[PDB]
Amino acid sequence: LERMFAKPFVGQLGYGHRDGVYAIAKNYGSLNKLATGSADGVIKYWNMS
Amino acid sequence: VRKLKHHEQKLLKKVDFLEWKQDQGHRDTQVMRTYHIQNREDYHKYNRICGDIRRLANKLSLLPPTDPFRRKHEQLLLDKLYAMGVLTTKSKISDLENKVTVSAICRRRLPVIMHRLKMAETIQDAVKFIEQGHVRVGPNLINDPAYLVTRNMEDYVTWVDNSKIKKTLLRYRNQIDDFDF
Amino acid sequence: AKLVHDVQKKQHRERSQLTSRSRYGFLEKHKDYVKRAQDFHRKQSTLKVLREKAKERNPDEYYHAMHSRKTDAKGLLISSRHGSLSMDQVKLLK
Amino acid sequence: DDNMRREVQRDLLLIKHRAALDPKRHYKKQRWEVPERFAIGTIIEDKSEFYSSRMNRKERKSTILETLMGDEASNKYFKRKYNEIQEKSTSGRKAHYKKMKEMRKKR
Amino acid sequence: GLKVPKAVQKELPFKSQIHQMKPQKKKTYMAKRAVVLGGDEKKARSFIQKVLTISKAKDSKRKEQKASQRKERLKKLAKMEEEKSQRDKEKKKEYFAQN
Amino acid sequence: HTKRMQHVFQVKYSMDSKYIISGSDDGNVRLWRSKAWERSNVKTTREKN
Amino acid sequence: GPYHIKYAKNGTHLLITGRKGHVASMDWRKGQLRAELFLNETCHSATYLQNEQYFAVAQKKYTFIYDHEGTELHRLKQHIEARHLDFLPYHYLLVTAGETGWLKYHDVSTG
Amino acid sequence: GARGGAKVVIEPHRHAGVYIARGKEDLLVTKNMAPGESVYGEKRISVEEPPTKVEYRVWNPFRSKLAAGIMGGLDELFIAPGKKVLYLGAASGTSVSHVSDVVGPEGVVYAVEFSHRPGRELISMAKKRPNIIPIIEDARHPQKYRMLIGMVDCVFADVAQPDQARIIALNSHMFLKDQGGVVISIKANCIDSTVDAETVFAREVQKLREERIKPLEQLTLEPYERDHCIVVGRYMRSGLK
Amino acid sequence: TRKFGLVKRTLNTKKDQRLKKNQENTRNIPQVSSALFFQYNQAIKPPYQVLIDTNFINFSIQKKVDIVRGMMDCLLAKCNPLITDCVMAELEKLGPKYRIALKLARDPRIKRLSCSHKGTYADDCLVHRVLQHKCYIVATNDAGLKQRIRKIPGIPLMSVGGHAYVIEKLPDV
Amino acid sequence: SRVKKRKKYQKAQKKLKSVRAVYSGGQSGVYEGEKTGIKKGLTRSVKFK
Amino acid sequence: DDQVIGKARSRTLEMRLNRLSRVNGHQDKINKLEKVPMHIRRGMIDKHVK
RNA sequence: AUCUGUUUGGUGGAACCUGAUUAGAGGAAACUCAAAGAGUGCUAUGGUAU
Ligand SMILES: [Zn+2]
């Protein structure tokens, strides 16, 4: 049963970055928040919920 | 058993309380229903005969094609079965393996032959008349509904002389002659 | 229509019965004859089938409907026009 | 009710075949088997529709068939059309056959 | 209509026995009893007969119309089917000319 | 893994320890279950046991 | 007669098999008859399968599996002249032995 | 056509709570909750049943867009007897009264309107129909009247605003049940007059999918209205896939 | 009293409900779009909305044709390219070899459409969208897809060939 | 040429009405019902797959 | 051909017939491996390769 | 009317052909006895048990 219920992927955050993601930081005080950055120079703040 | 949920079904794919492989698809029951056989072992006795015909047909096949023995025996086996009525045609030797079936032997049973001869409306109805002693083949009354009627004997199947059935036929056409009865 | 004049495709008017024979009726044309020939063959085809069915009839054929049904002294089937009244029924009707 | 009053029966039979009532209407194609639950009702106009969409009482009838035959244009139309169909259906039938055998007789 | 000879008619199987109905000559009691509503209802029994006669002929003519355009159309299509068939052969000769 | 994931450069946990956040160089930030067979709905006491 | 009797595992149902071929399945407390077969053969023993719904009967030469209402479901051709029948409930295995001296285990679930 | 004294045959429609009146012409009719009066002057059909005199109202497609939806043959309407319906953009009782008819005495209708001049008329019609809850408040702010609306089996929106996609979403999130119905009437001129009609309908459908509403069907309302389409969707909170 | 023709009761496969095979056992005609006058799509007007197929992006890189410029050159109108989630999924699924295609496909001018069907097969998704709404140009070079779009009436079909794009069923050109 | 294209177009308008419904100004006069009748069992509606 | 008897004659005929068929008959339909369950067939191949 | 004979409805269902089915097809009763399917109702409450 464990194998046929093993469905780890839940989804992806928005449309993602233009270029590869190289720096991810989690907010240690909030559960559903994340900060990411890409080689394009863009940094985003996500609402994981 | 209740309809199995999705997770139960995956863990119980092969469970089937009503159909097993050794049943061979319930070919037993199906042929019995169509021709209304009453003895549960009548199919398998017919099957064992059909197998033996098929075994000989193979052993003849493996013999070389031009062999006089092969041609002689195969022709004899075709004529014998055709005379019995099991085989409709004597042309092709492949019929011994393809068209030799239990249903072929069953169709020559007395209940079915009456139904084809229209002496009865249905096979079940025709079986009842045999058990009632209304049916004769030649001058001998027959109460066994498993009488296998050959092609030549199929001409002599008729109602009994004093049968109430025979009186209705003649009465319906206003041809009843009481001197005969 | 390619390389064909309109004059080529002119209706050819079709004649009539002579006056001397006018009593007998309409002069049949090929289309008229075809209707006759098909009609006769259609009937003859069915009539042939019925004769064959008579020849192959099994005298011993039994149907449970034979009790309700009745036949004529000529031998033809009798069928009720609509398909006896008890005295109590008649008294109410009267 | 199982009585199936003939006035009601003719009304529904006049709606299954409504395509032929009027030669200028030509409704859609549909079958309309008789439903097992239906009711007959009379329209009630608005008081503002007194001149436009109101029927006079003498014209009002309990049944549709009563109003339809009350008309004169439709009644005339059916007489013309029905007679024409009879000529089509009676052409070449037994009456015709006897005449052709009558001419062969000298008088 | 076809009239089967009585000799053939007499000896027919039970399944195929033609039902020929004899006319009634002695007046039945029910035939002498039933009441026929006259006057107003007569005008309302002819009319329904007149309506149903038009409706059948209208349908029987439009149905004949569909069969007329059915024949011309399929003749047109079989020509199109022929063109797509012969040209299909040509392509399979050009292709297998390579192979 | 996934055929659309190309070079994992960062991996992090949600602060509840139930999910995994992954960042590849393709430009997407994906969410994963820490335990594939577990589900996040509140379970009846009979389920839990 | 004579009659061979086998109760269900939970004791709710009773299966009696006459030697001349009278097989009856009933709920003996409430006096309810579930099925009654009059096989004109020599029955030797019968047993209940996983529950009262199915029971097996050792007839003259083959064992037959039947439904709650008495409808046949299978003819066990592989078991020949079984005289003793037993059911391992947890394993869903049917066991037979007879004059052939062959001990055959048959899985009811998979057949 | 359908004159005063003419008799008609009333039979049930495929949708529950809607009836067809046959004759020389066919009329879409709904049973009247408040017999003996007409709310916008429609024709009415009176039937004697054992005897009590039931009354029916004619439903005019050219006046109510939902009626045009029936005529064009919408496959699924979530408005049915014994169901709570939230009607946004209830200008007056022209169409709400007919929606109130279908749901029956058991069901209810929450009529939402903003402008006060029609509101006074909406209240007046509401008193005759007990199963109508009139809410004179802006539909852009569903929170203001959260006390007044419970769960609703379906949401019908005829609001003519460019930002209707937000109105439908916010009301659906608060009040619409899971697997519940959504019916929207879209007028392309109102949303974006610059671009053609089809793009607006295609654009509008996309917003619904973003808002977790699965569109089941779109129908255009011609010949009754030009530039209109009714989109029927199901509110699938769990997942639209 | 006894009945005649008694037969043993046995399982009837054809009629028994418990068996799986026996256990299992409003006409619709879609409206012809009001945007279509016979075969001419009257509703489509500039600027155009274009659906990009996965092959289209690759072949665009093959010929050095910019997506926005090639469209804006071909139709002489502003074109609003649209990439659905399926098309993006296929591009990601191709692998490291087609990374250039992915980076161009993410150009912010190229708008994104969400999708609500499980499969990633893009060909079916595009064909469904064009059927419902007659307001898209289909940009593809796949032979199979182009033939499907040709049967659907009033769907302009764009492809990349030679040195620049080509539009087939768009009268306004 | 002008006359022929005039008649070709007006003929085309007639055929368009048969293929699909067309807006024709809306209601004119009292609503007299649907002249050609209602079909209970037909949906002319386009379903998303 | 006249002397050969037994299985050899059955196998000989099948081999001859297949050879003539391969020229014109489509590869998928001319030759069809007999159906065997998954677990068995990998067993036969593994031993045969061994 | 020892007139005429088309149409509407009811009664009946030969031949050919087509489709489906087949231990022939049905019907009635119930506080009867079984084997299953769907929906609905019910604080349906130990996230670590006074
Ligand atoms: Zn998609």
PDB file of C-alpha atoms and ligand atoms in Angstrom, chain I residues 86 115 117 125 129, ligand 1:
ATOM      1  CA  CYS I  86       0.972  21.799 -22.062  1.00  0.00           C
ATOM      2  CA  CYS I 115      -4.934  24.513 -18.424  1.00  0.00           C
ATOM      3  CA  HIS I 117      -6.771  18.693 -18.138  1.00  0.00           C
ATOM      4  CA  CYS I 125      -5.515  20.805 -25.955  1.00  0.00           C
ATOM      5  CA  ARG I 129      -9.592  25.447 -27.559  1.00  0.00           C
TER       6      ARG I 129
HETATM    7 ZN    ZN M   1      -3.798  22.368 -21.471  1.00  0.00          ZN
END
